[PDB]
Amino acid sequence: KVFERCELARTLKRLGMDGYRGISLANWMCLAKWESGYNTRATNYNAGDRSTDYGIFQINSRYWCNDGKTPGAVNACHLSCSALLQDNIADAVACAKRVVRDPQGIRAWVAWRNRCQNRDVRQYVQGCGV
Ligand code: NA
């Protein structure tokens, strides 16, 4: 599914993401936009290290989900990577919350540092009613 901006913003609020471990809704929105363009079925194979990024938040298979084919991988969210390609984002959100529970927090995603950190991120939630 490709979410529309405000549709996603309202969905993430209801799933308890606003201020989760100190992270504002607008930052989660900036993250999803730059990772996948709000697309739940986005996958990106990383040839450099044989891992794959899955779903709306492009969660990596080396640490977070199991796809079987990534060497030396763990599965900290206790999910098949397949769960991260559903239209319903409940599992992707539960796994994203697990990612930011580590010390790096939202910095775990490099796209966030590049595209979101120290920016005016108000634009991603403006007029959405959240
Ligand atoms: Na894994």
Swiss-Prot record:
Disulfide links within the chain: C6-C128, C30-C116, C65-C81, C77-C95
InterPro entries the UniProt entry points to: Glyco_hydro_22, Glyco_hydro_22_CS, Glyco_hydro_22_lys, Lysozyme-like_dom_sf
Location in the cell: Secreted
GO molecular function (one): identical protein binding
A biological process term (GO) from this entry: defense response to Gram-positive bacterium
Gene3D superfamilies on file: 1.10.530.10
Location of the active site: E35, D53
Recorded catalytic activity of this chain's protein: Hydrolysis of (1->4)-beta-linkages between N-acetylmuramic acid and N-acetyl-D-glucosamine residues in a peptidoglycan and between N-acetyl-D-glucosamine residues in chitodextrins
CDD domains per record: LYZ_C
Disulfide bond keyword on record: yes
A GO term from the CC aspect: specific granule lumen
Residues annotated as domain C-type lysozyme: 1-130
More details: Lysozyme C is capable of both hydrolysis and transglycosylation; it also shows a slight esterase activity. It acts rapidly on both peptide-substituted and unsubstituted peptidoglycan, and slowly on chitin oligosaccharides.
Annotated function: Lysozymes have primarily a bacteriolytic function; those in tissues and body fluids are associated with the monocyte-macrophage system and enhance the activity of immunoagents.
Disease as annotated in the protein's UniProt record: Amyloidosis, hereditary systemic 5: A form of hereditary systemic amyloidosis, a disorder characterized by amyloid deposition in multiple tissues resulting in a wide clinical spectrum. AMYLD5 primarily affects the viscera, and the predominant clinical features are renal dysfunction of varying severity, and intra-abdominal bleeding. Inheritance is autosomal dominant.
Subunit structure: Monomer.
Family from the record: Belongs to the glycosyl hydrolase 22 family.
Name by which UniProt lists this protein: Lysozyme C
Protein source organism: Homo sapiens (Human)
